[PDB]
């Protein structure tokens, strides 16, 4: 019923704001509490901060002094603002419901009560690279093929990460394999992605590869065959 | 000289000074070694010094011993007798004012049990009357002199001190080790009194009608707080379970009523002193042990002890 | 932060303890999280856990003081390999903003499963950009580690070849990438080029020549 | 102590009090009597 969905640049220089945004499908913005976590390579999951339903804001000590964290009610959108970003900032930051949890021990006449907050649902993430280095959209390549026959399409030199790849603009699902980058020495990420469809499917189901590459703008397509 | 901090719980605003984490030196079993120790200290026996630097309530004024921590502070009740060719004579009256004829007499050997218990304003485990509720002054149009009410039913009442102590044997010399406060085993929370708010209505009532025969059945009367002196006086403390409590009796005396709950109870917020000073003397003064576990002692208030203003 | 590592035998039951212990009354939320994916919050309060996740995932209540705060997964499969967190939020200490340590559960005893190598020549519209790259792609292998070995005809080469560290695939087997790049001189020059896998004991080959 | 630094053996137990050096240790035969009566 409720979920939500971040946004991000993909890429940011050093020593400038990082800016993200995350959106609410299903239910409201301003009855609820939102979080934000991040998790970089090696490190741990990190809670950056909160907002409440009143948009009453409070940040961790880590990263106080330079987190912003804002609510859009006309559009139940809430946006983060991380400025002087480092190397260290790079990684994937996540958005997610918090819920107010009321732990009571004595007598709430007394204050014998604390708050604890939970988030019970998360998005998916938005990968951030912080780098001097600019952007470059891929090459594109098809990979022909030979019970049955596997072919595919190969996506080369592109920076940052990720690179998202459908096939058939959607249509075709069962059998994909998208693997994992590679980091050559240039800098620069290679992909691959790969379906194993029946051998007499060659003459002539049509099969469109589908590469996007956000942080370029650079959406590209590509047929393959024998 | 005691070098403290505050000791955990991020609790209520100014509630965390309440109890305090003081750490000193002290002496040794060897008179040219110190020792760097530490111990839980409440605030109501310690003052700053003017940095977080605090000495024992007591250093000015008295010095201090600590009790024994093998006796009980738990009343037995007393029996007093007169040598042999005395007697003892009881005054049977069942609405007897203290002073005057009795017609009903009888000779006792040895009084009834009587418990040395020491309290303020509520009177505790005391003896109940069988009618009405008499009302005790020796010179009643004098607001000079403190009214001593007796109730008939027992309005009962329930402290703790809900934190778990633990205490921590500290040798400052051969043969004597002083009990600190070792810490606080689960939650901080604050010590206090429970008395059912139907009975206590109740009972403050027929203290009311009894109060009228001296003042006229016109006239208003009006239950407020103390209003000062020492910390004694101005709280209902006793002791429970070993710990001397101080309880805040606002919600006690805060009642005018006129010529003419059910579910709930009301709480009372009792504080906690370890260094207690002598009543009617000073450079006496006495440091009652840290009673280890949970405390809670359930008594009745059997009396009070009020006093006229001189509506 | 640092990560503590726990193993699990396929089918026995996890008893992952909490990086720190609660001073008071507690309310301790568990977080499961596997790299590269959002976290899945298993338990909220102390015992309480949210729709969608099955009963073999317990937590202890706060009943009396002095038990310590242990998620307990019964039953465990390959797909609860993750990092799982301890939220821990007592009446004594402050806000609890860290997450805490991570416990990375490793689940022992799951079948071996051997690669599936596929190697791919270079494609024509590479080839005429005076470029050209050999992609060597191996899949649904467990436990995942591979080794791969590339060679010229016969003699090896190890020069301008890059590779992937294993990826766990969504069927909880692994995943691994390997691009040798030459000039397309090179790879014209050569009679054919191999792909070597080795995974556990044995090694596979997959060939590729320009015909 | 753990050199050759000590202490008294006592130190640590109890309070020590020395005897009165005027007053005899030497045992002399004391009579126990009863009340008139017994
Ligand atoms: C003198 O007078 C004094 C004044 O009267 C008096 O002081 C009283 O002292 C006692 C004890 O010292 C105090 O009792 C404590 O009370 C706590 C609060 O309990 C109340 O609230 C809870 C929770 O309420 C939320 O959830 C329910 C649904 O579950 C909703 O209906 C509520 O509306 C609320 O939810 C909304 O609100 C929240 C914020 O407001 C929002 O965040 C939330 O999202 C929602 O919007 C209720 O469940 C309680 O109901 C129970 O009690 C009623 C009677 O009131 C009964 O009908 C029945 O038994 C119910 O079960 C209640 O209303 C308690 O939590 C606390 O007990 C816990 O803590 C102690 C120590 O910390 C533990 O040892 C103990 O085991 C309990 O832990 C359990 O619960 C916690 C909290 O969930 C868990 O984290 C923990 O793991 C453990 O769970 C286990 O047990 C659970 C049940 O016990 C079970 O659910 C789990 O599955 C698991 O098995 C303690 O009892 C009392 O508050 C003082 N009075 C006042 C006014 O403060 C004093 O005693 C007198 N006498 C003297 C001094 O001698
Ligand atoms: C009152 O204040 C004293 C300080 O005078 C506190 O004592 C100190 O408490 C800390 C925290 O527990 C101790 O450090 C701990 O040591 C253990 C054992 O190596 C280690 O596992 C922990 O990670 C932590 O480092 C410290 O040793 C201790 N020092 C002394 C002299 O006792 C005390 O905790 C305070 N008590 C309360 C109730 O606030
Ligand atoms: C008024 O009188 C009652 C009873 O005459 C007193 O209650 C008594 O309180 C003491 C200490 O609070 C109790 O001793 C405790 O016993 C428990 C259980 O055995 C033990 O765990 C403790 O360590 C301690 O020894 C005693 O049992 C209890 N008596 C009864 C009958 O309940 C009350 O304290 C008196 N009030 C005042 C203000 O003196
Ligand atoms: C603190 O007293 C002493 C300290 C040192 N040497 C002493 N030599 C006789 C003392 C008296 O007996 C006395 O003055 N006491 C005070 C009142 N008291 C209580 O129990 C009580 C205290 C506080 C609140 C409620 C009740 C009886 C007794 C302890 C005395
Ligand atoms: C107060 O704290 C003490 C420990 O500081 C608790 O004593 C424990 O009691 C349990 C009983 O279930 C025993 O199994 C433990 O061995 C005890 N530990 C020690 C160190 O003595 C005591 O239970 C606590 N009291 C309350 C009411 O919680
Ligand atoms: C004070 O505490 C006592 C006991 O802890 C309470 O008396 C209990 O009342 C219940 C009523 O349901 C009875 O079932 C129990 O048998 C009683 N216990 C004893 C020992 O008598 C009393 O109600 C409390 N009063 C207040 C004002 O808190
Ligand atoms: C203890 O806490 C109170 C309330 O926050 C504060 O005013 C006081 O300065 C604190 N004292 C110490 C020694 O930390
Ligand atoms: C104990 O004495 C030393 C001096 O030797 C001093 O520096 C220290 O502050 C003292 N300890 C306390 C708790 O005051
Ligand atoms: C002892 O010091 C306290 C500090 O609060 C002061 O109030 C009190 O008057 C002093 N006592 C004497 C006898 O000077
Ligand atoms: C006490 O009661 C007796 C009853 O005869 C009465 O004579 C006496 O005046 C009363 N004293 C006071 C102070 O009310
Ligand atoms: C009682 O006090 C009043 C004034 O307060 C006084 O007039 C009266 O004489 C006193 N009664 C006795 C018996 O001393
Ligand atoms: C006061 O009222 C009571 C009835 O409650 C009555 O018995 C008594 O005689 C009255 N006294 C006066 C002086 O009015
Ligand atoms: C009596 O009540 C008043 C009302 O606020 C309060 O200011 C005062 O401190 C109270 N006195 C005592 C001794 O509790
Ligand atoms: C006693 O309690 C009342 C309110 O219940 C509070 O206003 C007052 O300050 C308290 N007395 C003291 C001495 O703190
Ligand atoms: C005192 O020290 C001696 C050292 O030999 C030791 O045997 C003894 O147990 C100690 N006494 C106490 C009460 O610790």
């Known amino acids: 019923q409720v979920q939500l969905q971040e946004s991000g640049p993909g890429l940011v220089k050093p020593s400038e704001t990082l800016s993200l945004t995350c959106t609410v499908s299903?239910?409201?913005?301003?009855?609820?509490?939102w979080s934000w976590i991040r998790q970089s390579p090696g490190k741990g999951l990190e809670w950056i901060g909160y907002?409440?339903?009143?948009?009453?804001?409070n940040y961790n000590p880590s990263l106080k002094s330079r987190v912003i964290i804002s609510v859009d009610t006309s559009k139940n959108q809430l946006s983060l603002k991380l400025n002087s970003v480092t190397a260290a900032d790079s990684a994937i930051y996540y958005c997610?419901?918090?819920?107010?949890?009321?732990?009571?021990?004595?007598?709430?006449?007394?204050?014998?009560?604390?708050?604890?907050?939970?988030?019970?649902?998360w998005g998916k993430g938005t990968t951030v690279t912080v780098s001097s280095a600019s952007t470059k959209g891929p090459s594109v390549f098809p990979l022909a093929p030979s019970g049955t026959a596997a072919l595919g399409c190969l996506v080369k030199d592109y920076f940052p990460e990720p690179v998202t790849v459908s096939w058939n603009s959607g249509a075709l699902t069962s059998g994909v394999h998208t693997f994992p980058a590679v980091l050559q020495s240039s800098g620069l990420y290679s992909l691959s992605s790969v379906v194993t469809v029946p051998s007499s499917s060659l003459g002539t189901q049509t099969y469109i590869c589908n590469v996007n590459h956000k942080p370029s703008n650079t959406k590209v397509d590509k047929k393959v065959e024998p | 000289t005691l070098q403290c901090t505050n000791v955990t719980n991020a609790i209520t605003d100014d509630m965390r000074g309440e109890l305090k984490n003081c750490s000193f030196n002290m002496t040794t079993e060897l008179r040219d070694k110190k020792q760097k120790v530490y111990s839980l200290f409440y605030r109501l026996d310690v003052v700053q010094i003017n940095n977080k630097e605090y000495r024992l309530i007591n250093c000015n004024t008295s010095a201090i011993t600590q009790a024994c921590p093998k006796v009980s502070f738990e009343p037995i009740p007393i029996h007093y007798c007169a040598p042999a060719g005395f007697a003892i004579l009881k005054c049977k009256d069942k609405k007897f004012n203290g002073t005057g004829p009795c017609p009903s007499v009888s000779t006792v050997q040895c009084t009834h049990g009587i418990k040395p218990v020491v309290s303020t304003q509520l009177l505790l485990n005391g003896s109940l009357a069988e009618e009405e509720v008499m009302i005790r002054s020796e010179n009643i149009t004098n607001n000079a002199k403190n009214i001593l009410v007796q109730f008939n039913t027992p309005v009962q009442i329930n402290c703790t001190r809900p934190n778990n102590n633990t205490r921590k044997s500290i040798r400052i010399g051969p043969g004597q080790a002083f009990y600190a406060t070792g810490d606080i085993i689960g939650d901080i929370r604050q010590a206090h009194c429970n008395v059912s708010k139907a009975t206590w209505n109740e009972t403050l009532g027929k203290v009311v009608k009894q109060l009228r025969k001296h003042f006229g059945n016109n006239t208003i009367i009006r239950f407020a707080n103390s209003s000062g002196g020492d910390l004694e006086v101005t709280t209902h403390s006793f002791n429970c379970g070993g710990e001397f409590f101080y309880c805040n009796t606002s919600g006690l005396f805060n009642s005018t009523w006129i010529s003419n709950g059910s579910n709930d109870s009301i709480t009372l917020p009792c504080r906690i002193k370890q260094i207690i000073n002598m009543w009617q003397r000073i450079g006496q003064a006495m440091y009652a042990p840290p009673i280890q576990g949970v405390i809670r002692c359930v008594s009745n208030i059997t009396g009070l002890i009020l006093t006229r203003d001189g509506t | 932060s640092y990560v503590r590592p726990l193993s699990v035998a396929l089918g026995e039951t996890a008893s992952i303890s909490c990086g720190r212990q609660a001073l008071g009354s507690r309310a301790v939320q568990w977080y499961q999280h596997r790299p590269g994916q959002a976290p899945i919050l298993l338990i909220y309060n102390n015992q309480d856990r949210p729709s969608g996740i099955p009963e073999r995932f317990s937590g202890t209540p706060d009943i009396n003081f002095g038990t310590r705060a242990t998620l307990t997964i019964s039953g465990v499969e390959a797909g609860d390999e993750a990092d799982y967190y301890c939220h821990m939020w007592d009446s004594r200490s402050g806000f609890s903003w860290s997450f805490g340590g991570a416990t990375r559960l490793t689940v022992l005893g799951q079948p071996k499963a051997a690669p599936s190598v596929t190697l791919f020549p270079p494609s024509s519209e590479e080839l005429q950009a005076n470029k050209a790259t050999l992609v060597c792609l191996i899949s649904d292998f467990y436990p995942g580690a591979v080794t791969v070995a590339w060679k010229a005809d016969s003699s090896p080469v190890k020069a301008g070849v890059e590779t992937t560290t294993p990826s766990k695939q969504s069927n909880n087997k692994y995943a691994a990438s390997s691009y040798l790049s030459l000039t397309p001189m090179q790879w014209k020059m050569h009679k054919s080029y191999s792909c070597q896998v080795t995974h556990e004991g044995s090694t596979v080959e997959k060939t590729v020549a320009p015909t | 102590i753990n050199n050759k630094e000590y202490r008294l053996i006592n130190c640590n137990t109890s309070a020590i009090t020395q005897a009165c050096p005027k007053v005899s240790f030497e045992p002399i035969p004391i009579h126990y009597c009863a009340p008139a009566g017994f």
């Open positions: 997610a419901r918090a819920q107010q949890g009321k732990r009571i021990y004595g007598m709430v006449s007394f204050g014998e009560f604390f708050y604890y907050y939970y988030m019970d649902v």
């Open positions: 299903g239910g409201s913005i301003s009855n609820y509490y």
């Open positions: 907002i409440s339903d009143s948009e009453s804001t």
